[PDB]
Amino acid sequence: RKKRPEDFKFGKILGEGSFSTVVLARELATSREYAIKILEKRHIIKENKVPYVTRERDVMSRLDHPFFVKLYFTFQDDEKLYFGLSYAKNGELLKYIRKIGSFDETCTRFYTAEIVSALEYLHGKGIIHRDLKPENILLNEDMHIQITDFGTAKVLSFVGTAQYVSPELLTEKSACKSSDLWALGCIIYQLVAGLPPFRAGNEYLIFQKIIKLEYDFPEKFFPKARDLVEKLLVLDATKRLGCEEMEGYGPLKAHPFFESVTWENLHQQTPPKLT
Numbered sequence: 001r002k003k004r005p006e007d008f009k010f011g012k013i014l015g016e017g018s019f020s021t022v023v024l025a026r027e028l029a030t031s032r033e034y035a036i037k038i039l040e041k042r043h044i045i046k047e048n049k050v051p052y053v054t055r056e057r058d059v060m061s062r063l064d065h066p067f068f069v070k071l072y073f074t075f076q077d078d079e080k081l082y083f084g085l086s087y088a089k090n091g092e093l094l095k096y097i098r099k100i101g102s103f104d105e106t107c108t109r110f111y112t113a114e115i116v117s118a119l120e121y122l123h124g125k126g127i128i129h130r131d132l133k134p135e136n137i138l139l140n141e142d143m144h145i146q147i148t149d150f151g152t153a154k155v156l157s158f159v160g161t162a163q164y165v166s167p168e169l170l171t172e173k174s175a176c177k178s179s180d181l182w183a184l185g186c187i188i189y190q191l192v193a194g195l196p197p198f199r200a201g202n203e204y205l206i207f208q209k210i211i212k213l214e215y216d217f218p219e220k221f222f223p224k225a226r227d228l229v230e231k232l233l234v235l236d237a238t239k240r241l242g243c244e245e246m247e248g249y250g251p252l253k254a255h256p257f258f259e260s261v262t263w264e265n266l267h268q269q270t271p272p273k274l275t
């Protein structure tokens with residue numbers, strides 16, 4: 001029942017990573033479109049990444065939620081490994097933030113809720129993404145989010161994108177659930193302000209602001225959203241809304257900014273129009 005390269009009509013490159021290339025592929029017998037992640041075995045081996053590739057497949061394989069990419073299958077030929085992944089039609093969240101510049105409160109509210117909900121699920125299974133950002137949050141045909149990219153996930157080292165790096169990661173080489181929550185704080189900021197909270201000339205300078213908590217809120221910034229962001233962007237990883245020392249996701253979803261949200265079925269509501 002194993003699929004082979006010939007079973008697909010390959011197309012366009014959807015993503016080009018360091019140890020990987022994602023190509024759009026159309027399954028011939030079903031007509032279905034998949035995002036097929038391709039990897040060269042020699043390269044992975046030559047690069048000592050077997051543990052990374054292995055962990056990525058396993059984590060994804062244990063995922064069964066609508067706000068997450070799905071691993072539909074896997075096969076390999078002599079030279080390459082193929083991961084049949086969930087195809088997110090409307091691309092990256094980042095794409096939209098740039099197109100319309102900034103999100104209004106309703107859109108920010110809805111999409112942020114889906115990310116909390118997605119994370120609440122992820123952390124429930126003991127998995128940490130630890131490289132969460134708008135580029136990893138895709139949008140399917142219906143404009144609902146689809147988080148992808150688990151090449152850096154952990155299961156309860158590394159370091160994700162500079163702008164979203166957690167303080168403790170720069171201080172103690174540590175990384176916990178609360179670490180994904182810091183990224184969340186950054187993304188919300190970025191959704192409302194239109195830019196990530198910590199920006200600098202170089203990585204070294206970005207990290208400096210991070211550990212110093214050097215950032216400012218625009219006067220426009222939605223108040224309740226500003227209040228939430230402040231309770232996520234806390235240097236102490238034990239005091240971020242959502243981590244277990246703060247008693248988890250219950251408090252976080254009760255935050256005034258989500259007052260209006262019905263958490264029960266986000267996945268089935270129809271997304272607010274991006275304007």
Ligand SMILES: COc1cc2ncc3c(N)nc4c(C)c(N)ccc4c3c2cc1OC
Nearest residue numbers: 014015022035069085086087088089091148
């Ligand atoms: C139609 O637009 C897209 C659609 C896309 N749909 C699905 C995916 C996917 N499952 N995984 C990916 C991974 C793991 C990457 N490293 C890069 C891009 C994707 C990707 C994807 C990318 C797209 O454009 C940016």
